[PDB]
Amino acid sequence: SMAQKLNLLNLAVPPVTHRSNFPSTFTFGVATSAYQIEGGWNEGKKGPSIWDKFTHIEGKILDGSNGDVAVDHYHRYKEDVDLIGQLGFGAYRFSISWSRIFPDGLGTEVNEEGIAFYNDLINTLLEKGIQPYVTLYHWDLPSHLQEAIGGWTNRKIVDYFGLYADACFANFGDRVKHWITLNEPLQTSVNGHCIGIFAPGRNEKPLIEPYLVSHHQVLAHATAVSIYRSKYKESQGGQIGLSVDCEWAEPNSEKPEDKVAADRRIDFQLGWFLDPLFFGDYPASMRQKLGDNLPRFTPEEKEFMLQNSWDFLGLNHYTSRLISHVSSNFYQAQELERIVELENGDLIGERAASDWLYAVPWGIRKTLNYMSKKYNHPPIFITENGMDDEDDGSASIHDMLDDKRRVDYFKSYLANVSQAIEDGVDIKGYFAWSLLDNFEWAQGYTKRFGLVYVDYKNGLTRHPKSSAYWFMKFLKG
Protein backbone atom coordinates (compact mmCIF):
# COMPACT_ATOMS: atom_id res chain seq x y z
CA SER A 1 0.00 0.00 0.00
CA MET A 2 1.00 3.65 -0.30
CA ALA A 3 0.98 3.93 3.50
CA GLN A 4 3.61 1.19 3.67
CA LYS A 5 5.57 2.70 0.77
CA LEU A 6 5.84 6.10 2.46
CA ASN A 7 6.63 4.61 5.87
CA LEU A 8 9.56 2.76 4.28
CA LEU A 9 10.63 6.01 2.62
CA ASN A 10 10.86 7.74 5.99
CA LEU A 11 12.58 4.78 7.68
CA ALA A 12 15.23 4.60 4.95
CA VAL A 13 16.54 8.06 5.87
CA PRO A 14 16.42 8.42 9.67
CA PRO A 15 16.26 11.99 11.06
CA VAL A 16 19.91 12.05 12.13
CA THR A 17 22.43 14.43 10.61
CA HIS A 18 25.93 15.67 11.29
CA ARG A 19 28.17 18.21 9.59
CA SER A 20 30.43 15.37 8.40
CA ASN A 21 27.53 14.09 6.25
CA PHE A 22 28.08 17.08 3.93
CA PRO A 23 31.10 17.98 1.79
CA SER A 24 33.74 20.06 3.53
CA THR A 25 33.09 22.90 1.06
CA PHE A 26 29.29 22.82 1.51
CA THR A 27 27.82 26.23 2.38
CA PHE A 28 25.35 26.56 5.27
CA GLY A 29 23.40 29.79 5.56
CA VAL A 30 20.27 31.52 6.80
CA ALA A 31 17.83 33.50 4.66
CA THR A 32 15.63 36.61 5.02
CA SER A 33 14.01 39.14 2.69
CA ALA A 34 14.05 42.95 2.84
CA TYR A 35 10.36 43.71 3.32
CA GLN A 36 10.02 40.99 5.93
CA ILE A 37 12.80 42.26 8.24
CA GLU A 38 14.05 45.76 7.39
CA GLY A 39 11.55 48.32 8.49
CA GLY A 40 12.81 51.82 7.80
CA TRP A 41 10.13 51.85 5.12
CA ASN A 42 10.30 55.62 4.50
CA GLU A 43 13.91 56.26 5.58
CA GLY A 44 17.01 56.89 3.52
CA LYS A 45 14.89 58.35 0.67
CA LYS A 46 13.36 54.91 0.05
CA GLY A 47 10.32 54.96 -2.20
CA PRO A 48 7.19 52.99 -1.36
CA SER A 49 6.85 49.43 -2.62
CA ILE A 50 3.70 47.51 -3.51
CA TRP A 51 3.96 45.87 -0.09
CA ASP A 52 4.05 49.25 1.67
CA LYS A 53 0.83 50.08 -0.18
CA PHE A 54 -0.74 46.63 0.34
CA THR A 55 -0.17 46.37 4.10
CA HIS A 56 -1.61 49.85 4.63
CA ILE A 57 -5.05 48.65 3.48
CA GLU A 58 -7.11 47.28 6.35
CA GLY A 59 -8.07 43.64 5.75
CA LYS A 60 -5.18 42.51 3.55
CA ILE A 61 -3.05 41.22 6.45
CA LEU A 62 -4.45 38.66 8.91
CA ASP A 63 -3.38 40.48 12.08
CA GLY A 64 -3.71 44.01 10.70
CA SER A 65 0.06 44.50 10.89
CA ASN A 66 2.55 45.93 8.38
CA GLY A 67 6.26 46.00 7.62
CA ASP A 68 6.78 49.70 8.49
CA VAL A 69 9.12 48.60 11.30
CA ALA A 70 9.15 44.78 10.88
CA VAL A 71 12.08 43.64 13.08
CA ASP A 72 13.98 46.91 12.47
CA HIS A 73 16.93 45.23 10.73
CA TYR A 74 17.46 48.56 8.93
CA HIS A 75 18.78 49.95 12.23
CA ARG A 76 19.97 46.74 13.93
CA TYR A 77 21.77 44.90 11.14
CA LYS A 78 25.18 44.95 12.83
CA GLU A 79 23.82 42.95 15.77
CA ASP A 80 21.97 40.61 13.39
CA VAL A 81 25.21 39.99 11.47
CA ASP A 82 27.02 39.25 14.74
CA LEU A 83 24.33 36.67 15.50
CA ILE A 84 24.75 34.96 12.12
CA GLY A 85 28.48 34.66 12.76
CA GLN A 86 28.04 33.41 16.32
CA LEU A 87 25.61 30.69 15.22
CA GLY A 88 28.31 29.58 12.78
CA PHE A 89 26.69 30.10 9.39
CA GLY A 90 29.05 30.70 6.50
CA ALA A 91 26.61 32.60 4.30
CA TYR A 92 23.61 34.91 4.53
CA ARG A 93 20.89 35.12 1.88
CA PHE A 94 19.15 38.50 1.96
CA SER A 95 17.32 40.65 -0.57
CA ILE A 96 17.99 44.19 -1.74
CA SER A 97 14.99 46.55 -1.68
CA TRP A 98 14.60 47.87 -5.23
CA SER A 99 12.92 51.04 -3.95
CA ARG A 100 15.99 51.84 -1.79
CA ILE A 101 18.13 51.91 -4.96
CA PHE A 102 15.64 53.51 -7.39
CA PRO A 103 12.78 54.93 -5.27
CA ASP A 104 10.45 55.24 -8.29
CA GLY A 105 11.85 52.17 -10.08
CA LEU A 106 12.69 54.17 -13.21
CA GLY A 107 16.40 53.36 -13.04
CA THR A 108 17.86 56.78 -13.82
CA GLU A 109 19.00 58.33 -10.51
CA VAL A 110 20.68 55.96 -8.05
CA ASN A 111 19.77 56.63 -4.40
CA GLU A 112 23.11 56.99 -2.61
CA GLU A 113 21.62 56.49 0.86
CA GLY A 114 20.27 53.10 -0.21
CA ILE A 115 23.62 52.13 -1.72
CA ALA A 116 25.32 53.18 1.51
CA PHE A 117 23.07 50.93 3.63
CA TYR A 118 23.69 47.78 1.60
CA ASN A 119 27.40 48.56 1.32
CA ASP A 120 27.64 48.73 5.10
CA LEU A 121 25.64 45.52 5.51
CA ILE A 122 27.86 43.72 2.98
CA ASN A 123 31.05 45.07 4.55
CA THR A 124 29.86 43.99 8.01
CA LEU A 125 29.12 40.48 6.71
CA LEU A 126 32.56 40.17 5.15
CA GLU A 127 34.32 41.42 8.29
CA LYS A 128 32.80 38.37 10.01
CA GLY A 129 33.67 36.01 7.15
CA ILE A 130 30.04 35.59 6.02
CA GLN A 131 29.41 35.31 2.28
CA PRO A 132 26.54 37.49 0.99
CA TYR A 133 23.99 35.76 -1.26
CA VAL A 134 21.82 38.52 -2.70
CA THR A 135 18.25 38.21 -3.97
CA LEU A 136 17.53 41.13 -6.31
CA TYR A 137 13.71 40.76 -6.31
CA HIS A 138 11.88 39.40 -3.27
CA TRP A 139 8.42 40.80 -4.09
CA ASP A 140 8.88 44.50 -3.21
CA LEU A 141 8.25 46.13 -6.58
CA PRO A 142 8.46 49.96 -6.43
CA SER A 143 4.87 51.14 -6.30
CA HIS A 144 5.54 53.77 -8.95
CA LEU A 145 6.13 51.02 -11.50
CA GLN A 146 2.91 49.28 -10.48
CA GLU A 147 0.94 52.51 -10.86
CA ALA A 148 2.67 53.84 -13.97
CA ILE A 149 2.98 50.77 -16.22
CA GLY A 150 1.01 48.06 -14.44
CA GLY A 151 4.03 46.43 -12.83
CA TRP A 152 4.92 42.94 -14.02
CA THR A 153 2.00 42.86 -16.50
CA ASN A 154 3.90 45.28 -18.79
CA ARG A 155 6.80 44.05 -20.93
CA LYS A 156 8.75 47.24 -20.10
CA ILE A 157 9.22 45.87 -16.57
CA VAL A 158 11.99 43.73 -18.07
CA ASP A 159 14.06 46.79 -18.93
CA TYR A 160 13.47 48.50 -15.57
CA PHE A 161 14.60 45.31 -13.84
CA GLY A 162 17.69 45.24 -16.04
CA LEU A 163 18.70 48.75 -14.94
CA TYR A 164 18.21 47.76 -11.30
CA ALA A 165 20.20 44.53 -11.68
CA ASP A 166 22.99 46.42 -13.43
CA ALA A 167 23.20 49.02 -10.64
CA CYS A 168 23.46 46.25 -8.04
CA PHE A 169 26.17 44.38 -9.94
CA ALA A 170 28.13 47.61 -10.46
CA ASN A 171 27.91 48.76 -6.84
CA PHE A 172 28.17 45.48 -4.93
CA GLY A 173 29.61 42.75 -7.18
CA ASP A 174 33.19 43.32 -6.11
CA ARG A 175 32.03 41.83 -2.78
CA VAL A 176 28.87 39.86 -3.70
CA LYS A 177 29.66 36.68 -5.64
CA HIS A 178 26.30 34.86 -5.57
CA TRP A 179 23.25 36.54 -7.12
CA ILE A 180 19.62 35.38 -7.15
CA THR A 181 17.52 37.30 -9.66
CA LEU A 182 13.96 36.52 -8.56
CA ASN A 183 12.39 34.84 -5.56
CA GLU A 184 9.40 32.52 -6.09
CA PRO A 185 8.00 34.00 -9.33
CA LEU A 186 5.14 31.50 -9.01
CA GLN A 187 3.83 33.33 -5.94
CA THR A 188 4.06 36.75 -7.59
CA SER A 189 2.11 35.53 -10.63
CA VAL A 190 -0.57 33.49 -8.86
CA ASN A 191 -1.05 35.00 -5.40
CA GLY A 192 -0.25 38.48 -6.73
CA HIS A 193 -2.37 38.52 -9.89
CA CYS A 194 -4.81 35.56 -9.92
CA ILE A 195 -6.37 35.53 -6.44
CA GLY A 196 -4.81 38.76 -5.17
CA ILE A 197 -3.83 37.81 -1.61
CA PHE A 198 -0.27 39.10 -2.15
CA ALA A 199 0.67 42.56 -3.38
CA PRO A 200 -0.31 44.11 -5.75
CA GLY A 201 -3.57 42.40 -4.82
CA ARG A 202 -4.95 41.91 -8.35
CA ASN A 203 -7.65 39.38 -9.14
CA GLU A 204 -9.43 41.28 -11.93
CA LYS A 205 -7.91 39.40 -14.92
CA PRO A 206 -7.06 35.93 -13.58
CA LEU A 207 -7.05 34.20 -16.97
CA ILE A 208 -4.53 36.69 -18.39
CA GLU A 209 -2.38 38.55 -15.88
CA PRO A 210 -0.71 35.55 -14.12
CA TYR A 211 0.72 34.44 -17.46
CA LEU A 212 1.88 37.90 -18.49
CA VAL A 213 3.57 38.24 -15.09
CA SER A 214 5.37 34.91 -15.38
CA HIS A 215 6.34 35.70 -18.99
CA HIS A 216 7.96 38.96 -17.93
CA GLN A 217 9.58 37.52 -14.81
CA VAL A 218 11.24 34.83 -16.96
CA LEU A 219 12.46 37.46 -19.43
CA ALA A 220 13.60 39.73 -16.58
CA HIS A 221 15.65 36.91 -15.10
CA ALA A 222 17.27 36.14 -18.46
CA THR A 223 18.03 39.85 -18.89
CA ALA A 224 19.79 40.02 -15.51
CA VAL A 225 21.83 36.90 -16.31
CA SER A 226 22.78 38.42 -19.67
CA ILE A 227 23.84 41.70 -18.05
CA TYR A 228 25.88 39.84 -15.43
CA ARG A 229 27.62 37.52 -17.89
CA SER A 230 28.36 40.15 -20.52
CA LYS A 231 29.42 43.09 -18.31
CA TYR A 232 30.43 41.89 -14.83
CA LYS A 233 31.22 38.18 -14.53
CA GLU A 234 34.62 38.36 -16.23
CA SER A 235 36.04 40.78 -13.66
CA GLN A 236 33.88 39.85 -10.66
CA GLY A 237 33.95 36.06 -10.98
CA GLY A 238 30.64 35.30 -9.26
CA GLN A 239 27.57 33.25 -10.13
CA ILE A 240 23.93 34.07 -10.87
CA GLY A 241 20.77 31.99 -10.45
CA LEU A 242 17.13 32.21 -9.40
CA SER A 243 15.08 30.77 -6.52
CA VAL A 244 11.93 28.82 -7.39
CA ASP A 245 9.57 27.11 -4.97
CA CYS A 246 8.30 23.61 -5.54
CA GLU A 247 5.89 21.54 -3.50
CA TRP A 248 6.82 17.97 -4.32
CA ALA A 249 4.22 15.96 -6.28
CA GLU A 250 4.05 12.24 -5.46
CA PRO A 251 1.55 10.06 -7.37
CA ASN A 252 -1.35 9.07 -5.09
CA SER A 253 -1.40 5.59 -6.67
CA GLU A 254 0.38 3.49 -9.27
CA LYS A 255 -2.24 4.42 -11.88
CA PRO A 256 -0.51 5.86 -14.98
CA GLU A 257 -2.72 8.95 -14.93
CA ASP A 258 -1.56 9.78 -11.39
CA LYS A 259 2.06 9.78 -12.54
CA VAL A 260 1.10 11.98 -15.48
CA ALA A 261 -0.77 14.27 -13.08
CA ALA A 262 2.21 14.49 -10.71
CA ASP A 263 4.50 15.33 -13.64
CA ARG A 264 1.99 18.00 -14.68
CA ARG A 265 1.92 19.39 -11.14
CA ILE A 266 5.68 19.92 -11.30
CA ASP A 267 5.42 21.38 -14.83
CA PHE A 268 3.03 24.08 -13.63
CA GLN A 269 5.28 24.95 -10.64
CA LEU A 270 8.89 24.55 -11.80
CA GLY A 271 8.70 24.04 -15.54
CA TRP A 272 6.66 27.22 -16.04
CA PHE A 273 9.83 29.18 -15.23
CA LEU A 274 12.73 26.82 -15.90
CA ASP A 275 11.67 25.18 -19.17
CA PRO A 276 11.70 28.44 -21.18
CA LEU A 277 15.30 28.92 -20.05
CA PHE A 278 16.45 25.32 -20.53
CA PHE A 279 14.35 24.08 -23.46
CA GLY A 280 13.28 27.36 -25.04
CA ASP A 281 9.54 27.14 -24.37
CA TYR A 282 6.90 26.54 -21.73
CA PRO A 283 6.11 22.92 -20.77
CA ALA A 284 3.94 21.18 -23.35
CA SER A 285 1.44 20.28 -20.62
CA MET A 286 0.89 24.01 -20.05
CA ARG A 287 0.76 24.84 -23.78
CA GLN A 288 -1.77 22.07 -24.47
CA LYS A 289 -4.13 23.18 -21.70
CA LEU A 290 -3.78 26.97 -21.68
CA GLY A 291 -3.84 27.76 -25.39
CA ASP A 292 -3.82 31.43 -26.31
CA ASN A 293 -3.68 32.71 -22.72
CA LEU A 294 -0.07 31.50 -22.46
CA PRO A 295 2.10 34.04 -24.34
CA ARG A 296 4.48 32.87 -27.06
CA PHE A 297 8.18 33.69 -27.12
CA THR A 298 9.70 35.13 -30.28
CA PRO A 299 12.66 33.29 -31.84
CA GLU A 300 14.95 36.06 -30.59
CA GLU A 301 13.60 35.60 -27.06
CA LYS A 302 14.11 31.83 -27.24
CA GLU A 303 17.73 32.27 -28.33
CA PHE A 304 18.20 34.88 -25.59
CA MET A 305 16.81 32.64 -22.84
CA LEU A 306 18.74 29.56 -23.95
CA GLN A 307 21.98 31.55 -23.71
CA ASN A 308 21.07 33.07 -20.32
CA SER A 309 19.50 30.33 -18.17
CA TRP A 310 21.52 30.12 -14.93
CA ASP A 311 24.79 29.24 -13.25
CA PHE A 312 22.89 27.48 -10.45
CA LEU A 313 19.31 26.69 -9.44
CA GLY A 314 17.98 27.80 -6.06
CA LEU A 315 15.27 25.54 -4.66
CA ASN A 316 12.78 26.88 -2.10
CA HIS A 317 11.16 23.78 -0.61
CA TYR A 318 8.85 23.27 2.36
CA THR A 319 6.33 20.50 1.72
CA SER A 320 4.88 17.75 -0.48
CA ARG A 321 1.53 16.35 -1.63
CA LEU A 322 0.10 13.15 -3.00
CA ILE A 323 -1.44 13.85 -6.40
CA SER A 324 -4.54 12.31 -7.97
CA HIS A 325 -5.72 13.03 -11.50
CA VAL A 326 -9.12 14.76 -11.65
CA SER A 327 -10.53 15.50 -15.12
CA SER A 328 -7.95 29.58 -9.48
CA ASN A 329 -8.12 28.53 -13.12
CA PHE A 330 -4.35 28.21 -12.85
CA TYR A 331 -5.07 25.44 -10.36
CA GLN A 332 -8.08 24.16 -12.32
CA ALA A 333 -6.05 23.82 -15.53
CA GLN A 334 -3.87 21.29 -13.69
CA GLU A 335 -6.78 18.79 -13.46
CA LEU A 336 -5.71 17.21 -10.17
CA GLU A 337 -6.22 17.17 -6.42
CA ARG A 338 -3.61 17.61 -3.69
CA ILE A 339 -3.83 15.04 -0.91
CA VAL A 340 -2.33 14.83 2.58
CA GLU A 341 -4.40 11.97 4.04
CA LEU A 342 -3.64 8.35 3.26
CA GLU A 343 -6.61 6.01 3.02
CA ASN A 344 -5.88 4.58 6.49
CA GLY A 345 -6.51 8.08 7.90
CA ASP A 346 -2.90 9.05 8.62
CA LEU A 347 -1.29 12.18 7.22
CA ILE A 348 1.81 12.18 5.02
CA GLY A 349 3.37 14.47 7.64
CA GLU A 350 2.71 16.65 10.65
CA ARG A 351 1.41 20.13 9.91
CA ALA A 352 3.27 23.25 11.02
CA ALA A 353 1.58 26.61 11.72
CA SER A 354 0.99 27.43 8.05
CA ASP A 355 -2.07 25.54 6.80
CA TRP A 356 -0.16 24.35 3.72
CA LEU A 357 3.09 23.30 5.43
CA TYR A 358 3.20 19.56 6.14
CA ALA A 359 6.57 18.16 7.24
CA VAL A 360 7.40 15.51 4.62
CA PRO A 361 11.18 15.08 4.73
CA TRP A 362 11.51 12.56 1.92
CA GLY A 363 9.94 15.12 -0.42
CA ILE A 364 13.01 17.36 -0.49
CA ARG A 365 15.14 14.45 -1.70
CA LYS A 366 12.59 13.67 -4.43
CA THR A 367 12.56 17.31 -5.56
CA LEU A 368 16.36 17.54 -5.67
CA ASN A 369 16.73 14.34 -7.70
CA TYR A 370 13.96 15.43 -10.08
CA MET A 371 15.63 18.79 -10.75
CA SER A 372 19.06 17.23 -11.26
CA LYS A 373 17.80 14.65 -13.74
CA LYS A 374 15.53 17.02 -15.67
CA TYR A 375 17.99 19.92 -16.00
CA ASN A 376 21.23 18.04 -16.72
CA HIS A 377 22.83 17.95 -13.26
CA PRO A 378 23.19 21.68 -12.50
CA PRO A 379 24.63 23.10 -9.30
CA ILE A 380 21.73 23.42 -6.86
CA PHE A 381 21.35 25.42 -3.64
CA ILE A 382 18.45 24.89 -1.28
CA THR A 383 17.74 28.60 -0.89
CA GLU A 384 14.84 28.14 1.60
CA ASN A 385 13.66 25.35 3.90
CA GLY A 386 12.06 25.63 7.34
CA MET A 387 8.83 25.69 9.31
CA ASP A 388 6.69 28.02 11.39
CA ASP A 389 5.12 28.15 14.85
CA GLU A 390 1.79 29.85 15.54
CA ASP A 391 1.63 33.01 17.66
CA ASP A 392 -1.40 35.32 17.43
CA GLY A 393 0.12 37.54 20.15
CA SER A 394 -0.91 35.32 23.07
CA ALA A 395 1.61 32.48 22.77
CA SER A 396 4.05 31.94 25.63
CA ILE A 397 7.57 33.13 24.82
CA HIS A 398 8.91 29.99 26.46
CA ASP A 399 6.81 27.75 24.21
CA MET A 400 8.11 29.64 21.18
CA LEU A 401 11.74 29.24 22.30
CA ASP A 402 11.59 25.49 23.03
CA ASP A 403 10.99 24.71 19.39
CA LYS A 404 11.61 20.97 19.41
CA ARG A 405 9.44 20.50 16.32
CA ARG A 406 11.64 22.89 14.31
CA VAL A 407 14.73 20.98 15.46
CA ASP A 408 13.12 17.75 14.24
CA TYR A 409 12.15 19.42 10.95
CA PHE A 410 15.72 20.49 10.22
CA LYS A 411 17.24 17.16 11.31
CA SER A 412 14.86 15.16 9.11
CA TYR A 413 15.08 17.35 6.01
CA LEU A 414 18.85 17.81 6.28
CA ALA A 415 19.27 14.02 6.45
CA ASN A 416 17.44 13.86 3.12
CA VAL A 417 19.54 16.68 1.63
CA SER A 418 22.64 14.70 2.62
CA GLN A 419 21.19 11.60 0.96
CA ALA A 420 20.40 13.51 -2.25
CA ILE A 421 24.10 14.37 -2.41
CA GLU A 422 24.88 10.66 -2.13
CA ASP A 423 22.29 10.08 -4.87
CA GLY A 424 24.41 12.28 -7.14
CA VAL A 425 22.79 15.73 -6.92
CA ASP A 426 25.34 18.56 -7.12
CA ILE A 427 24.08 20.35 -4.02
CA LYS A 428 26.32 23.28 -3.15
CA GLY A 429 24.62 24.64 -0.05
CA TYR A 430 21.56 25.03 2.13
CA PHE A 431 19.85 28.09 3.60
CA ALA A 432 17.45 27.85 6.54
CA TRP A 433 14.35 30.03 6.39
CA SER A 434 14.64 32.12 8.46
CA LEU A 435 17.32 33.73 10.66
CA LEU A 436 14.61 35.32 12.72
CA ASP A 437 10.87 35.64 13.12
CA ASN A 438 9.55 38.24 10.72
CA PHE A 439 6.57 39.55 8.73
CA GLU A 440 5.04 36.55 6.94
CA TRP A 441 3.19 38.39 4.16
CA ALA A 442 -0.63 38.03 4.40
CA GLN A 443 -0.24 36.16 7.71
CA GLY A 444 1.52 39.13 9.32
CA TYR A 445 3.58 38.29 12.38
CA THR A 446 1.37 35.32 13.32
CA LYS A 447 3.79 32.79 11.77
CA ARG A 448 7.23 32.50 13.41
CA PHE A 449 9.80 30.94 11.03
CA GLY A 450 12.94 32.08 12.83
CA LEU A 451 15.77 30.21 14.38
CA VAL A 452 15.83 33.38 16.52
CA TYR A 453 12.77 34.71 18.35
CA VAL A 454 11.86 38.39 18.05
CA ASP A 455 9.94 39.89 20.96
CA TYR A 456 7.22 42.08 19.47
CA LYS A 457 6.12 42.98 23.02
CA ASN A 458 9.47 44.33 24.29
CA GLY A 459 11.92 46.20 22.06
CA LEU A 460 12.17 43.62 19.21
CA THR A 461 14.71 41.75 21.34
CA ARG A 462 16.38 38.78 19.68
CA HIS A 463 16.37 35.49 21.62
CA PRO A 464 17.92 32.45 19.90
CA LYS A 465 15.64 29.41 20.05
CA SER A 466 16.56 25.80 20.73
CA SER A 467 16.88 25.37 16.97
CA ALA A 468 19.49 28.16 16.80
CA TYR A 469 21.63 26.40 19.41
CA TRP A 470 21.15 23.09 17.58
CA PHE A 471 22.48 24.66 14.38
CA MET A 472 25.39 26.16 16.33
CA LYS A 473 26.39 22.72 17.62
CA PHE A 474 25.68 21.06 14.26
CA LEU A 475 27.82 23.55 12.35
CA LYS A 476 30.77 23.15 14.74
CA GLY A 477 30.86 19.40 14.01
From Swiss-Prot:
Organism: Arabidopsis thaliana
Protein's job: Glucosidase that hydrolyzes scopolin and various beta-glucosides, cellooligosaccharides (mainly cellotriose) and laminarioligosaccharides. Can use p-nitrophenyl-beta-glucosides (pNP beta-Glc) and p-nitrophenyl-beta-D-fucosides (pNP beta-D-Fuc) as substrates, and, to a lower extent, beta-galactosides, beta-mannosides and beta-xylosides. Involved in the secretion of root-derived phenolics upon iron ions (Fe) depletion. Promotes disease resistance toward B.cinerea, H.arabidopsidis and P.syringae pv. tomato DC3000. Required during rhizobacteria-mediated (e.g.
GO BP terms: cellulose catabolic process; induced systemic resistance, ethylene mediated signaling pathway; positive regulation of defense response; response to bacterium; response to iron ion starvation; secondary metabolic process
GO cellular component, one term: cytosol
Tissues and organs where the protein is expressed, per its UniProt entry: Expressed at low levels predominantly in root epidermal cells.
Induction: Accumulates upon rhizobacteria-mediated (e.g. P.fluorescens WCS417r) induced systemic resistance (ISR) in root trichoblasts and, to a lesser extent, in cortical cells.
Protein name: Beta-glucosidase 42
Sites where a glycan is attached: 416
Phenotype seen when the gene is deleted: Reduced secretion of root-derived phenolics upon iron ions (Fe) depletion, thus leading to their accumulation in the root interior. Impaired P.fluorescens WCS417r-mediated broad-spectrum induced systemic resistance (ISR) against several pathogens.
Keyword Chloroplast: no
